[PDB]
């Protein structure tokens, strides 16, 4: 399973962010709002979660052979990931997620504060003009082979467009001592 693909727990669905390694052990990053739900996922067991404030979580794979170091493009192809980086305003990016598949746009703001009402406030989010819908959370924000973020939320949808926010992937990697595969 690769970045942007569906990960589930009972009746809930999110998207996998990036497959990563923690001291040689295969894990997957996803959104914190997702991992808060449960410890048991289709792909393994949750070993960390942080939401709100942040929006990241990590799941240890039950099957290490499944830790695919790519992002699925939803057209029968995949994008290889080799590093993690920081986003910059005006950067051309792509997002992969299980509801809407692959979409592109650009970064319009950094360090944005996002108020999700009853769900709380998240800080330091990447802001983009890429659309997303429920189910897309945790999915990959990338630019070529460089990993940038995990889908958190936004407004609108993919028919009318909207604004979306992403948790910077580097903060999630350093929180867990992980490296992208």
């Amino acid at each position: 399973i690769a970045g942007g693909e569906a990960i589930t727990t009972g009746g809930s669905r999110c998207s996998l962010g990036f497959n990563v390694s923690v001291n040689g052990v295969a894990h997957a990053l996803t959104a914190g709002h997702c991992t808060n739900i449960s410890a048991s996922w289709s792909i393994g067991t949750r070993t960390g979660t942080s939401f709100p404030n942040n929006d990241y979580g990590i799941i240890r794979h039950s099957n290490p052979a499944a830790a695919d170091g790519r992002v699925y493009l939803y057209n029968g192809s995949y994008q290889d990931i080799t590093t993690a980086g920081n986003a910059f305003v005006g950067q051309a990016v792509q997002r992969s997620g299980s509801t809407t598949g692959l979409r592109s746009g650009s970064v319009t703001g950094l360090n944005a504060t996002v108020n999700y009402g009853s769900s709380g406030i998240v800080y330091g989010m990447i802001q983009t003009n890429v659309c997303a819908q429920p189910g897309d959370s945790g999915g990959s924000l990338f630019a070529g082979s460089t990993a940038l973020g995990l889908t958190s939320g936004g407004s609108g949808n993919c028919r009318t467009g909207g604004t979306t926010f992403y948790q910077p992937v580097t903060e999630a990697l350093s929180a867990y001592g992980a490296t992208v595969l």
Partner: peptide, 4 residues
């Protein structure tokens, strides 16, 4: 905005 809301969490996706």
């Amino acid at each position: 905005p809301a969490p996706f």
